[PDB]
Amino acid sequence: TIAVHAGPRPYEDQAVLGAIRAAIKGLQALSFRYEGGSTPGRTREVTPLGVLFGRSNYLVALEGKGGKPRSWRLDRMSDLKVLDKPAPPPQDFSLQAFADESFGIYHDEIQDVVLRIHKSRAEDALRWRFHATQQVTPEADGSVLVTFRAGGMRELSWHLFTWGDAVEIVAPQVLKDMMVQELREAGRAHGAW
Amino acid sequence: IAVHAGPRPYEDQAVLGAIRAAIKGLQALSFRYEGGSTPGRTREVTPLGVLFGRSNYLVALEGKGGKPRSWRLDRMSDLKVLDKPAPPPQDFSLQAFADESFGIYHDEIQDVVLRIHKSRAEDALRWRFHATQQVTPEADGSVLVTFRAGGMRELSWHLFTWGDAVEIVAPQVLKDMMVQELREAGRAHGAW
């Protein structure tokens, strides 16, 4: 296409990344050797559904007969082949559907997030999509209250940092602690205080 | 089939498809802008490509005698794909355009040089900060990372995700911003 993804990203091995699309456009299956998970290093078979690019590149897929929608890290993968073998996708499987029942994390258990964005970036708050299932509430002081139910507290905290002092983390406590700890860590190394 | 999760802005394919239509038809595209230097006027451009990231941006030439520029998608309205010839310049590369800044913002290009601590050297090696990056292994197991790019506001926002594993050795501006952001955020959130 005529689009390019700007910004930092993980490095690519398009050799292996070209092998996965070879079986979703043929509705076939794949198989690799994992380097993680509950079984350390076996070779395993899997039905492909999609890839999610992030600061870690994943691969949504179920194993063999039946399965569970879970995504394998492409860094901890070993030697795939486009099985000669068919494996059609579940019909109602949206790939965005995987991507929103958490955040830039997966399965880190879901939290009721409450943010207060001051006036200054209130209009910026309305425009911004923190999570699909979000609700923005105006307040009497022109600040706006942003609440949504999501995972990925760490990524969230990284993103809130870019809002600077326009955000006020109201809930949950794990997010406050997440942010403070991260600010203390970075603030020491770069000499902020 | 691979969209990126996280806080991606509310985007619209009704205009993303229309920009693709004007590009591959090699014809001009016009829209009115809900932003920019002029509040709400109809601009007419040669569309070149879109940038994906912190939001989505049309890269386009407006009128004749202009440099490439960027337009927030979510801020273009009432777009029409016209029948005038609008081929791209033969020299333009969208990739080279995007490479001129660490993020979206095109400002003074800086030789940035970072040091990543040994505990995260393996991650730095496997991480593409920028298209022009070189990494050199240092004696103590830490790694030096250098590249040329503008947009250090966005750079310092990313560096924060590296915790205390990253040291900014140049440019000075990137250092100052990083510290000022940390103080401000740290005061807002009660970290010190």
TrEMBL record, chain B:
The lineage's top-level taxon is Bacteria
Which interval of the chain is the signal sequence?
A: none
Q: What is this protein called?
A: Uncharacterized protein
**Could you say which residues of the full protein are shown?**
140 to 331 of 331
Q: Which organism is it from?
A: Caulobacter vibrioides (strain ATCC 19089 / CIP 103742 / CB 15) (Caulobacter crescentus)
Cite the WYL domain residue spans from the record.
15-81
Q: Where is the WCX domain?
A: 110-185
